[PDB]
Structures are given as structure tokens and as C-alpha cells.
């Protein structure tokens, strides 16, 4: 074939937060630099065109504004959604930071403790941390007046709460206080839009010319011979010879492409638990790609992946505004806060739906402490009640357990390629149901003391030992998938060494969820970033590169 | 503005339904969810060396494949989680288009059809004249990468089968064999689209809207008084109404009628009482003294497929199909590009089979073969040549007892409940005869092996560690059945909703049992008929 490619010095895999952060570390320091992403654009800066009709004057996409979040799951044509991953991935420049909640928190000590699986030499997380959160600054007043809207859900559950003795704080002025502590939802936005990694981390990048961003490239594999990573397989024929584009000698693969996409890659590079290649072996396309047999790396890819077992709890109290379910925010919003949002950027749609967080530490029968996380917001998805109620009065807390819990589960590909769940995650050790009920009690344990609060899913008639039996597991996805090619220190139990390197190659690299060990104690996205700055420091500090 | 017909949805069911009635005079407004597909139709997504030609993926036969292997397939309806088209002509755009015209037996009343529909020849007739079928689609009248067809042919002979042109004669299948027959024209994707819907598309009286979703239908008891969208400019916060007479058809395919349906309070309880737990989505339903109890989603069947795998030293197995839209073979290329001949101009299956088996319980099943050059998955333990690859698939169809169940999960999206494959023990036993049958003189044709199963496996042993779920043929149908009692059906013999003054479905769930053969031939001519008993029907507009 005739065309020519450019050699890189990284090709990174996916434009997620691991991977922006990663091209972006990179790029700084001077490297060539060419990052790749399937989807297409998000956000308007990234050349993202789906805007409201009542935001067309703006061209603020659904993607840049915060109240659209829930506008996300309610769409009769959801296009950022991978369409060959079974469960929810953002497929769009961003990746899940396009599409999610944005609740943002800033890792404490113990999310990056050896304890939980992180070598010795990444403890001391607070320099990545702190670059962090000089990009991304946390806000609990996203609004640019800086009052906060729609709150009505945050004043009723902070008098639950109260009342079980928490206390209110500014939950990332102090990352450390987690237990019997709640506060105002914070998120990574500035100037009350989306933010995150998309508008800053990629700006400063795109700005260099030693960086160059492809969107619409789908990687199918990479390329090698043994433990040498030539370059990736791609299905794009003008950024080199039938798609495939080379490092340099000296060059570098980052897999960046999330929990699922990652593990895809790796399966049909050879690398992984020999039923996963052996499934990508039974697509005769695909096996054309595939390395010899004896050139195979058998490594945990897609065990032990750990994802938040969460039950959505639904009550009603009068004082609450459902905000029309979130119904109305695309086609059909109240017309006030919708101009007041296209004016300056304040008001309801300047935050997600989310309102309160909360956390307690429990302490487990098999010595592990546990943490449980409400996250409060008006509306609800799926309510069960045999006794008439209010749906404009409805609000959810969502719980779940984060920090501590022992199950682990399985991701992988199915025959047709696909990324799904082999073995669901939730739930799998019986101490962290145990404890989940324990704490889903606790919740609930004072809502007499609360005049006009009544719990209506599962409702009076239901018990909550009915309803975890009872719930469909699958929907206690929580989305914060982790942990599916851990970082650790053998092969035999991890798929990545202390420098992120997939073990068995020279020159492969994962910066991306699957390489955190456990869940942190709050929603991912914060530990991710700032374990996405500390693997960019690794690799820059690790000789022999280019 | 007011319509006397609303229909839902522009597949062949919903096109052909606003063709005929908007023929008639009838003010008649189709809606599709989805966008454009082929040229003609607005569609843009052309193969890098098709650009010339404006003809995308869905109008070039031969990139039927490419349909299942594209990084970004917008094609799929993304809230069912099977297969189902979501784009202007539904499946009949992204389908193999196999095409059999209905034998008599598709349209018996012992399977389930009222007496009055029996008589489909004035309406297969319509359709055959609109459609013409073609075992030959490409323009130079040639047949193309035929190998695997010369090879099958061979060991069907070795069973007693005979060679026929199959619609020629279509009440006859049993020990017949031909070359695979399509509803192209010209070289290129036909269908609906190129017909049907062009001729609707002429006349003043009839309005295409693409990108609309219904989400239910609005009633007041029985009287259905229009359509809810989610296009804020079509009518009042998304709401179309249709004219004091007027009627809306419901043509949205298996999944989604049902959940439309169901949406609307029509279906069994807890299939409404799932819509009931999202709150939006229950803001919509009538009260519950006013749901009406129909087996919406019951009775649903789809062929179960099975796919045998085989090698023969004289097979093009075409690259597995992989690299017809990026890089194809430029001969080939070329030749579709000058005159839509070629390769290109078919699809990938070459050779159709059929025949009648006895069941033990008194039915007679009807297994037909389908042949093509690749394969999607091989599971060998032994080397091959992947060049070599095609695949026979074997599905049961006429007489099969198998019933499953479709409907919605928790978020509204359409899926199986109860998988239809093999539910009844005789449709497997019978299954199995076909597949031992198929195999039974492999050892006569030199260079034939099977590799999937490969030697190790038995047949009864791939059977059983078959994953169900791939087993689906996308033939979906009876899942809103025509009946004479809705304690077992859902429409009547005028395809009006039982309990309803004005609500109708023209789409593959009337159909109360899978036909002979792949069943679009079927479904348009039933979309006929059924087009011809509404307009017949009094009290309409
Ligand atoms: C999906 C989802 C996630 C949420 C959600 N909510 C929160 C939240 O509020 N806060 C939080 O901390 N985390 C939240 N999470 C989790 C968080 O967003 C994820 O943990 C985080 O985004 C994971 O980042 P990664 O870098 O591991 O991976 P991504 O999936 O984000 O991005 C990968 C990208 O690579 C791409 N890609 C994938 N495969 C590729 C391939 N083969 N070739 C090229 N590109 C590829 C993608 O298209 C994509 O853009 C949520 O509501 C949803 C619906
Ligand atoms: C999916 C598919 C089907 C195939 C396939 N192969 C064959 C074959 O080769 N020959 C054959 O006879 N049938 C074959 N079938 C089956 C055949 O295509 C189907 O049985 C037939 O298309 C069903 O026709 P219906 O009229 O029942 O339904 P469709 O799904 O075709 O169309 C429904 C339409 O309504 C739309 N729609 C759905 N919900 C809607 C809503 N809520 N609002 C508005 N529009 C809606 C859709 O977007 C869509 O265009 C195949 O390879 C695939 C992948
Ligand atoms: C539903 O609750 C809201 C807010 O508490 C109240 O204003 C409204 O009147 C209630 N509706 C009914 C039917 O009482
Ligand atoms: C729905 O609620 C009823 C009682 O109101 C309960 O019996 C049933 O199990 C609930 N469903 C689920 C899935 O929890
Ligand atoms: C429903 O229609 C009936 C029969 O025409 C009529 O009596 C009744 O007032 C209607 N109800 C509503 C709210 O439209
Ligand atoms: C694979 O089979 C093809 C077609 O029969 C043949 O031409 C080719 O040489 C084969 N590859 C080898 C050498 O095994
Ligand atoms: C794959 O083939 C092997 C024999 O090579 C067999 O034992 C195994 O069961 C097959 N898998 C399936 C799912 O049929
Ligand atoms: C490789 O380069 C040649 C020109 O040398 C082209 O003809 C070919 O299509 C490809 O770009
Ligand atoms: C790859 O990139 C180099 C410079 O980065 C170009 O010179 C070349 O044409 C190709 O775009
Ligand atoms: C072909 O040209 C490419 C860029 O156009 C170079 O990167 C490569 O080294 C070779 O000269
Ligand atoms: C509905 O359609 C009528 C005519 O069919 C228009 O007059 C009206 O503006 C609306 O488009
Ligand atoms: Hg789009
Ligand atoms: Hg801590
Ligand atoms: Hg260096
Ligand atoms: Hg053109
Ligand atoms: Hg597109
Ligand atoms: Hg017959
Ligand atoms: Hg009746
Ligand atoms: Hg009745
Ligand atoms: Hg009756």
C-alpha cells in the first residue's frame, strides 16, 4: 500500500479523561504526541453541534450544559453511547466526562493507600492531586452568581441527616473527612458549563504543535512483534498504510479507551485471559490480526473488575420541586431558567441533577471498613408504589458502597465482540450486602422525625431485605467501572506495573479506570484525573522512552 | 392539522399501508423515528469508493455485510436490544433481502389466519408486479462468486433435491433448491423504499416525517384521538390528532408497536405497569380502569437459526466480507461503480433450500438452508483455511410450535423476556433430523469438511452449547397477532386493535406464524391485504 505515516513518539487510545490528561502531560514535556478517539465531537469548543431548540442562539450543545444531564438517558437517539458495550460508556470526545453526572471529588489518602492495591511509589498522590485541582477547581456553587438552585432536595435530606448525627462540610476543602459528613454536590465545571478534561486539558494540548487529535478512529488492535509494540491497527487508511500508524523507535501505546474499550484492544492484541483471545480468535477477521499463540500475554485482563453496588431509594416530601422529572429540560423548559442560563450561564441548568452527598464508614464482620454514598437529586427513574403519591414532590437517594467492599466481578467480549459483564459485580460478598442493608436502614432509620417525608419505592408495604432481593442487579450499574487491568506488581494478579506498563511489553501503557485497584470512596472520575497525572510524571520518568 | 390516517413507523408494513390508503385519497401522514437511508432518500453514508455513485451502504447489495461490521452502526434502533432498523424502510434497509413470495400455506387459516385473509393471490400479486423478484440482481443478467452454491448444489442433489427458479413456484419447497432471490431493482436495494414509498411520496394528500418519535397514542377509551411525538412542530406539545373518522396505524415492527402499546395502556398488566414505573412515561397512560388486556408481546416467534460452518478448496470466501466498504476488490469495485453489475450487486447469500419434515406431534416444519461465502464465527480446533469459509444456516419455519415473549424492561428499552428458540422439545428434535440430514453426505464431496462443529463436537452437543440468544433470525412475528378473540390475539381481521374504534397495526406482528420462507415476502403482502381491509372497512374516513 502507498501512504506514508507520521511516527509518534505516544499514541494514546482514546480521548477520556485518562487519556487527555495523558496527552496533554505528555505533549507539555515536549513529546510527539498523536491521540485518537473513536466518536466524534461533544461539547461546541470540540465542534459539537447538538443544541437545545430553546439554546440554538448559543450553540451550547447538550453536552455543555450541566441541567441536560439527565436529558442524557431520555433521548430517542442517544449517539454518544458505544454501540458495541453493553452497559453505558461515553463514545465522544471525553469519553464519560462528556456525559456524566460530573460529581467531582477530590481522592483522599485512603483511595491511593497500598493497602488497596497501589504500589508503595503512588501513595503520596497530593503533588498529582494538587496539579489537579489547579486545572480543575472544585465547585458546590456551579452557577456563575454563585447561588446555588434547585436545592430543595438538599434541605430535606440535611435535616435526615443531622438528625443521625452528620455534619455538613465543603466536601473538597477537606478530602479526608468522609465519615458522617454530607454537602453540596460538587462538580468539575467552570463558568457554569461542563468542563473537565474537554476544556482544559485538551486546549492547552491542541494549542502545541508537537500534538495532534484525530476523532472518528477507531483502534482495533495494536501492533507487535512480542513484547514490541510497533504501532496501533486503526480503520482509518490516511493516517497510514491500511490503517496501521507506527511509534517511534524509542515510541510508545497508551491505551486510554476505558474499561471496556481497553480490555477490547488488549484481547485482540493477544493479551488477556486465554478464553477472551480465544473468543476474538473465533472471528476469522479478527483473527487475522491476532499474534502467533506462543506470543500470547496471559494476564487478569477484565478480572477483578469492581464497579458500586447502587439502590435508588424514592421518597416524597411537599416542599419538593421534581423539576418535571427532568422531562422538559430539552424541548420544553420552564422558559425563566432557561433564559436565565443562555444569559449568563446561572440557575437550575447550571448544575446536574445531583444536590446532596453523603458518606458513612461502617465496620465489617471480615475486618474491612466499609464507606456508603448517598447522592440526593430531585426526580426519580423507576418508582414501585401501591399507594397513590405526588410525582411532582419525588426525589432520590441513590446509595451505594464505595471504599472497602471485597466483590469483585468480570468484564469482557462476548462472540459478536461486544463489551459486557461476564460476572456481575455487585453484591458477590455477602459482607458487603450485609452492610449495604445496614446502611440502607440507617438512611431511613429517622424519616418519622422528618414531618411530610415518606419513603414511597419501596414503599410502606415492602421491606428493605424484599427489596435488595428483589432488585434487578444489573441495575445497580453504577457506572464507575474500575480495577478490569489493575495496577499491581505480578502478572499473576495484574495486568499493569507501577509504571503502567502492561507486563510482557516493552512499551505498552494503560492510563485509564481499569488500572485503579479498588473504588474510592466517592464517585471515580476525581481519583482517575489525578491517577491520570501521576501515570503521565511515571511515564515521562521511566528511561528508555522516547 | 388533522390526518385522516396516522401511520407509525415507514416500514414495509407502514409504507405500504401509506401508499395504498394515500392512493385512495386519504389525507395520510407516515412518521419515522429514524433518517434517511438510501440515496434517494437523503441518505449520505457512501462507501469511500462508491462516491460517485451516491450509493450508500444501504443501497449496494453487496454491503449488506458491512452492516454488522461498522465501528458506528446509526442504523440500529438503539433502545431494542436485537436487531431492528431504525431508518427510513425499517429492516427491509438493512436486511439480506431475501425475498419469497407467500404460498398459500403462509396464509392457511390452520395457522392462524381469519378465513377472509386466506385468499392473499390478489394481493401477492400487487406486490410481485411492484417488486419483481430477481435471482439474477445484477444488470448484466450474470450470477456472481457462486462457489459456494456450486458446492451446495452438489450435496443436495445427493439427497434428492432439484434445482427450481424458487418464486416461479412457491407453494412448492420441499427438496428444492435455487439461487438466493431478492427484491432488487437496477442493481441496487429496492424494497419499499424504491416503490411503494415514491409513489406515496407524488401525491398532495400524503406527508413523510422523518426523526419523529411516537411515544404513545392518546385515548380516551376506546377512541384513539391522535398521536403524542416528541416534534413540538408538528402539533400542540408534540400531539398530532387525527381527523372525527380518522385512524392510526401502528407500523413501528415487533418491539416497537408493542411498546408504543404498552405506553398507551394496551398490553398485559405487567408489561403496562412497567411504563407505570417511570414517572414521565405514566403521566401518559390513561387511568387503569381504562387499559385494555391484550397478549401485546405474547406469542412472539422468530426461526431458530443454526449455523454450520465449512471449508471446500474451490470457496472465495471474499475476505470474509471484511473489506467490501474500505478496500474493496477494485475489479469489483469498478464494475458496480460503471453499471451495477457485479458482485456487489447481490447480497452475500448465493443458495436457498428447503424441506418438510413430520413432527411426532402432527405438524409438518418446514427447515430451510441459507448458503453464503464467509462465516461470522468459527469455533475449530483444527487448522483451516479461512479463505475457504462459508456457512450453511438452518432454521425451522412453517409448522414450528415455539412461542416466546417480547416486551420492555424497566427502561423502556424493547427486549426479549422469554426466548422463542426451542421452547417446544419436537421444534428441537426436529431441528436436529434437519441438521444431521444437511451433513448426512458430506463424505460424497470430495474437499468438503465441516469445521463448525468441527469433528470433535456432535451436532447434539453444538445444539446444546449454543448460545440462544444468537440463535435469532430477526424474523420476529406474532407478537401483536391477528385472531378472532383477544383472549389469544391482538387485532381482528381488519387489523383493528380489539377494544378500539380506530387503532390498527399494519406490521410483521399480525402475522400469526412464521412463513416458509424469510418473511418480508410475506409481511408485504399481508400490509396489502391489510391496506385493502381497512379501506373496506365502514365508518372510516
Ligand atoms: C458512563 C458514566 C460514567 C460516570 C457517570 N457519573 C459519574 C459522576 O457523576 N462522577 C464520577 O466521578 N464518575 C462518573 N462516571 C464514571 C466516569 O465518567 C468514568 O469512570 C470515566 O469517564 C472513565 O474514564 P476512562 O478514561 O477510563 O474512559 P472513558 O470511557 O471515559 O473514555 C474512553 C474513550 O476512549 C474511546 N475509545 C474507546 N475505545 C476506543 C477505540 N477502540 N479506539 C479509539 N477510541 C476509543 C471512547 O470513545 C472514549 O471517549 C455517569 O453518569 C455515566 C452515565
Ligand atoms: C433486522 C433484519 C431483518 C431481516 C433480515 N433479513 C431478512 C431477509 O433477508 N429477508 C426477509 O424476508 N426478512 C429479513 N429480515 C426481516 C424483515 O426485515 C422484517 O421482518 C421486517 O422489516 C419487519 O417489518 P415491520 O414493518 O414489522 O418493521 P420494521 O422494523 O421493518 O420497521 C419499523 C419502522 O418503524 C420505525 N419506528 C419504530 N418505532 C417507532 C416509533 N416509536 N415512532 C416512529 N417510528 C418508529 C422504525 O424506525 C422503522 O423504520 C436481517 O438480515 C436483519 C438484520
Ligand atoms: C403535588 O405537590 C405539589 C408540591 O408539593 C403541590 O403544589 C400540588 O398541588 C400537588 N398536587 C396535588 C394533586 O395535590
Ligand atoms: C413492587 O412493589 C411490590 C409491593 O408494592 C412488591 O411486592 C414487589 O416485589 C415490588 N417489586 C420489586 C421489583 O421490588
Ligand atoms: C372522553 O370521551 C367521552 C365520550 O365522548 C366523553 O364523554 C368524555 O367527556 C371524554 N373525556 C375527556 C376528559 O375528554
Ligand atoms: C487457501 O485456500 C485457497 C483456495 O482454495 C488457496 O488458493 C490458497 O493457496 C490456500 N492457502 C494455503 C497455501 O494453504
Ligand atoms: C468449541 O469447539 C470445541 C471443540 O473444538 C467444543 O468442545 C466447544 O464446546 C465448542 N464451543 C461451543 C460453544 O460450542
Ligand atoms: C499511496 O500513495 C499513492 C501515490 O504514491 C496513491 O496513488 C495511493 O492511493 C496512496 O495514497
Ligand atoms: C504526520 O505528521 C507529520 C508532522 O507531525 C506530517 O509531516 C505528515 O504529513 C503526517 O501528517
Ligand atoms: C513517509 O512519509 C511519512 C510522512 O509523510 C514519514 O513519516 C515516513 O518516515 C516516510 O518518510
Ligand atoms: C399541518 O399541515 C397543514 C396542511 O396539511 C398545514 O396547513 C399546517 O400548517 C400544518 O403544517
Ligand atoms: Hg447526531
Ligand atoms: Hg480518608
Ligand atoms: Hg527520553
Ligand atoms: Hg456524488
Ligand atoms: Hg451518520
Ligand atoms: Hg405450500
Ligand atoms: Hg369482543
Ligand atoms: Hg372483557
Ligand atoms: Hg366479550
Not at 449495604?436 to 422525625?449: T, Y
Request: glycine letters at 10%; aromatic letters at 10%; hydrophobic letters at 35%.
Amino acid at each position: 500500500p502507498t501512504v506514508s505515516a507520521t511516527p509518534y513518539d505516544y499514541i494514546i487510545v482514546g480521548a477520556g479523561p485518562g487519556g487527555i490528561i495523558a496527552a496533554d502531560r505528555l505533549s507539555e514535556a515536549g513529546k510527539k504526541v498523536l491521540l485518537l478517539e473513536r466518536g466524534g465531537p461533544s461539547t461546541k469548543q470540540t465542534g459539537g453541534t447538538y443544541v437545545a431548540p430553546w439554546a440554538t442562539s448559543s450553540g451550547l450543545t447538550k453536552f455543555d450544559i450541566p441541567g441536560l444531564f439527565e436529558s442524557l438517558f431520555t433521548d430517542s437517539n442517544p449517539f454518544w453511547w458505544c454501540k458495541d458495550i453493553t452497559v453505558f460508556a461515553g463514545c465522544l470526545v471525553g469519553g464519560g466526562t462528556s456525559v456524566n453526572g460530573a460529581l467531582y471529588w477530590y481522592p483522599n489518602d485512603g483511595d491511593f493507600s497500598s493497602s488497596v492495591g497501589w504500589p508503595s511509589s503512588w501513595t503520596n498522590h497530593a503533588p498529582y492531586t494538587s496539579k489537579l485541582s489547579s486545572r480543575l477547581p472544585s465547585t458546590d456553587h456551579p452557577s456563575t452568581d454563585g447561588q446555588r438552585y434547585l436545592e430543595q432536595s438538599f434541605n430535606v435530606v440535611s435535616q435526615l441527616l443531622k438528625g443521625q448525627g452528620y455534619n455538613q462540610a465543603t466536601i473538597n476543602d477537606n478530602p479526608n473527612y468522609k465519615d458522617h459528613v454530607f454537602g453540596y454536590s460538587a462538580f468539575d465545571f467552570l463558568n457554569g458549563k461542563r468542563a473537565g478534561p474537554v476544556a482544559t486539558y485538551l486546549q492547552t494540548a491542541l494549542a502545541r504543535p508537537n500534538f495532534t487529535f484525530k476523532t472518528n478512529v477507531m483502534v482495533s488492535n495494536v501492533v507487535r512483534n512480542g513484547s514490541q509494540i510497533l504501532g496501533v491497527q486503526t480503520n482509518d487508511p490516511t493516517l497510514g498504510p491500511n490503517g496501521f500508524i507506527p511509534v517511534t523507535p524509542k515510541g510508545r501505546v497508551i491505551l486510554s479507551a476505558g474499561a471496556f474499550g481497553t480490555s477490547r484492544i488488549l484481547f485482540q492484541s493477544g493479551i488477556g485471559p486465554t478464553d477472551m483471545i480465544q473468543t476474538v480468535q473465533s472471528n476469522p477477521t479478527a483473527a487475522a490480526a491476532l499474534p502467533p499463540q506462543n506470543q500470547w500475554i496471559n494476564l487478569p485482563v477484565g478480572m477483578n473488575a469492581q464497579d458500586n453496588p447502587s439502590i435508588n431509594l424514592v421518597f416524597t416530601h411537599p416542599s419538593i420541586d421534581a423539576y418535571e422529572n427532568w422531562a422538559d429540560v430539552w424541548s420544553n423548559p420552564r422558559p425563566a431558567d432557561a433564559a436565565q442560563y443562555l444569559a449568563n450561564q446561572s440557575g437550575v441548568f447550571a448544575g446536574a441533577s445531583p444536590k446532596l452527598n453523603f458518606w458513612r464508614a461502617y465496620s465489617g464482620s471480615d475486618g474491612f471498613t466499609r464507606y456508603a454514598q448517598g447522592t440526593v437529586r430531585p426526580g426519580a427513574a423507576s418508582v414501585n408504589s401501591s399507594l397513590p403519591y405526588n410525582a411532582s414532590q419525588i426525589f432520590t437517594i441513590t446509595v451505594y458502597l464505595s471504599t472497602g467492599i471485597q466483590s469483585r466481578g468480570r468484564i469482557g467480549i462476548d462472540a459478536a465482540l461486544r463489551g459486557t459483564v461476564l460476572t456481575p459485580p455487585w453484591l458477590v460478598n455477602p459482607v458487603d450486602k450485609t452492610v449495604l442493608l445496614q446502611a440502607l436502614h440507617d438512611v431511613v432509620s429517622n424519616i418519622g422525625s422528618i414531618p411530610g417525608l415518606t419513603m414511597i419505592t419501596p414503599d410502606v408495604t415492602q421491606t428493605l431485605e424484599e427489596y435488595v432481593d428483589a432488585y434487578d442487579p444489573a441495575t445497580m450499574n453504577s457506572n464507575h467501572w474500575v480495577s478490569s487491568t489493575t495496577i499491581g506488581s505480578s502478572p499473576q494478579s495484574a495486568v499493569v506495573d507501577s509504571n503502567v506498563k502492561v507486563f510482557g511489553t516493552n512499551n505498552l501503557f494503560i492510563v485509564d479506570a481499569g488500572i485503579i485497584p479498588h473504588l474510592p470512596t466517592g464517585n471515580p472520575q476525581g481519583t482517575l484525573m489525578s491517577a491520570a497525572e501521576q501515570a503521565a510524571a511515571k511515564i515521562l520518568a521511566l528511561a528508555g522512552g522516547p
